[PDB]
Amino acid sequence: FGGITGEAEGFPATV
Amino acid sequence: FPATV
Amino acid sequence: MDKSELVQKAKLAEQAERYDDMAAAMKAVTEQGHELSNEERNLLSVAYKNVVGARRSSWRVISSIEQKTERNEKKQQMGKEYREKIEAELQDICNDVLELLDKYLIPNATQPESKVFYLKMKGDYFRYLSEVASGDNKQTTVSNSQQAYQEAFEISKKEMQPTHPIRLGLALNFSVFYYEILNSPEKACSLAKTAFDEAIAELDTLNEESYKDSTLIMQLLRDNLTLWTSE
Amino acid sequence: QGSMTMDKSELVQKAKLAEQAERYDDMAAAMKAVTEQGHELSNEERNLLSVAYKNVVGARRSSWRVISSIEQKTERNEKKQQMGKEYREKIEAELQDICNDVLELLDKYLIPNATQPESKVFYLKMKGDYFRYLSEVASGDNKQTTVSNSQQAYQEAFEISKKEMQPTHPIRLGLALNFSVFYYEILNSPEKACSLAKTAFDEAIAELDTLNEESYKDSTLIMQLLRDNLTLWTSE
Numbered sequence A: 001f002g003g004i005t006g007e008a009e010g011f012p013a014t015v
Numbered sequence B: 001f002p003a004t005v
Numbered sequence C: 001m002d003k004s005e006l007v008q009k010a011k012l013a014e015q016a017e018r019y020d021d022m023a024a025a026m027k028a029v030t031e032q033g034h035e036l037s038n039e040e041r042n043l044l045s046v047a048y049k050n051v052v053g054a055r056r057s058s059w060r061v062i063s064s065i066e067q068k069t070e071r072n073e074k075k076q077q078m079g080k081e082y083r084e085k086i087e088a089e090l091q092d093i094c095n096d097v098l099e100l101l102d103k104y105l106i107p108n109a110t111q112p113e114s115k116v117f118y119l120k121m122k123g124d125y126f127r128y129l130s131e132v133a134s135g136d137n138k139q140t141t142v143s144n145s146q147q148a149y150q151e152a153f154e155i156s157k158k159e160m161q162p163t164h165p166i167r168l169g170l171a172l173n174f175s176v177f178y179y180e181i182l183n184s185p186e187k188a189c190s191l192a193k194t195a196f197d198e199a200i201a202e203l204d205t206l207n208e209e210s211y212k213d214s215t216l217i218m219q220l221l222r223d224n225l226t227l228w229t230s231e
Numbered sequence D: 001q002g003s004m005t006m007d008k009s010e011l012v013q014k015a016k017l018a019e020q021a022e023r024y025d026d027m028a029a030a031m032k033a034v035t036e037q038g039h040e041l042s043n044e045e046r047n048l049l050s051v052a053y054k055n056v057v058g059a060r061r062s063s064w065r066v067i068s069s070i071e072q073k074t075e076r077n078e079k080k081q082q083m084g085k086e087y088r089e090k091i092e093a094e095l096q097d098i099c100n101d102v103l104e105l106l107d108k109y110l111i112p113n114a115t116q117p118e119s120k121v122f123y124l125k126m127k128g129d130y131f132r133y134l135s136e137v138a139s140g141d142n143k144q145t146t147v148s149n150s151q152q153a154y155q156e157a158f159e160i161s162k163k164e165m166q167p168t169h170p171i172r173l174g175l176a177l178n179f180s181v182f183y184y185e186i187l188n189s190p191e192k193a194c195s196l197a198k199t200a201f202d203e204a205i206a207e208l209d210t211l212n213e214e215s216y217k218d219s220t221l222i223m224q225l226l227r228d229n230l231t232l233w234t235s236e
Helices: C005-015 C021-029 C037-069 C074-104 C113-133 C134-160 C166-180 C185-201 C213-231 D006-019 D022-034 D043-073 D080-114 D115-137 D140-166 D173-188 D190-205 D214-235
Strands: none
Touching: C005 C037, C005 C074, C005 C113, C005 D043, C005 D080, C005 D115, C021 C037, C021 C074, C037 C074, C037 C113, C037 D006, C074 C113, C074 D006, C113 C134, C113 C166, C134 D140, C166 C185, C166 C213, C185 C213, C185 D022, D006 D022, D022 D043, D022 D080, D043 D080, D043 D115, D080 D115, D115 D140, D140 D173, D173 D190, D190 D214
8 A cells, every 4th residue: 555655565566 | 395494 | 807708697697686796797798888789788677676676675664664663662763774774775776877877878879769768767766766865855866767757758759669668668667656756646647548558559569579578568557557546 | 883882682673674674684794793792592582593594595595506407407608607607606605604604603602602402402403404504515525524513413402302392392393394304305314304204293293282372383384394395205
């Protein structure tokens, strides 16, 4: 939750 | 590999 | 040392998950001043992604702990100082990459696809700095990230097909920049959705060479849009 | 804010942060500093030291296996083959440095200061383990030495554990687990390995109905590993 401020499960993807 | 702890 | 030697070292280091060795090898290759092959570019990118990624991950963990520990518990002095240690490493790593980009990689880029790849990379590493920056330093890193991404975006829009993996990957990361760094959910979703939709409209243009990389990134665009609208 | 101005509580807090951050070199350095203050470690501190160095050495064990596999499959190419050998030897050197650091801590501080049998068994088990990791990459007369030193440490740990600890004790299990693996993988003695594992497993099931839920969880976890290895091995 909260993107990069939360747990890794909720990080948005980048390449 | 076998388990170790 | 010669180039082929260093490339083989990087490849061994990659397999062994020894990313400091991998990064050192490919930094040496880059500093020889010749334009990188796509293979070399990939090795450099993967190495530093992993080296900086370790610090991003660690910083997030310690930041979170710092916020759980009460201010009157005052064991958070140590959390703060450890966070600062990790921050300093992250800033040094990004500085090194940005040095390589400015001195070698962007100026030696001959084709538009390469220029976009490296401007995107510049955007990415200023974004990483922006994740941990504060104050006037943060204003600078955020602005530098946006400029690099937008310049990459302008080249990409003119020179590359919507299904090209570098164009798609730029959209993916630039959209995350809007969402996570600029706190602009509408712009982030619009950028990701437009990129996805433009690629679908031209899906016929996939070929054996690039269909896997392109469709992987289309799935990631969808995944972020799903995350952002699960909200 | 250096290690020599920190007290034990601060060094342990640092080790715990490093663990969460998956910064195992920092974690090991903190617990090495605690160890060098010269007092017996708590169970918590013991576990932190062990976890830290297990991850530090484990990275090199993993890398070594990967590079070894790559050498096995590399095409004829003198320069590439030489590079792979030299890179493996670099990793071996790191691994030996790490093991020697741990073995020096064990001999100079931990083992001489250990008083409780439970702590003696833990540390002798660690000594067995790190000589076993050295063995994995050793050759020649060096290997004869590391194998022997591993066996001796495990054996003394085993004797003390059988005399002074309950069969369900997670340290006594785990010692049995690792010593059995030493027999199977290092001494190439499958029947000794299986006998050790089976006996330890049996002595433990005999007393599972004496443990509260937490202890039961801890013991049965390691018992499953013994069973897993026996399954792995009783297929031949």
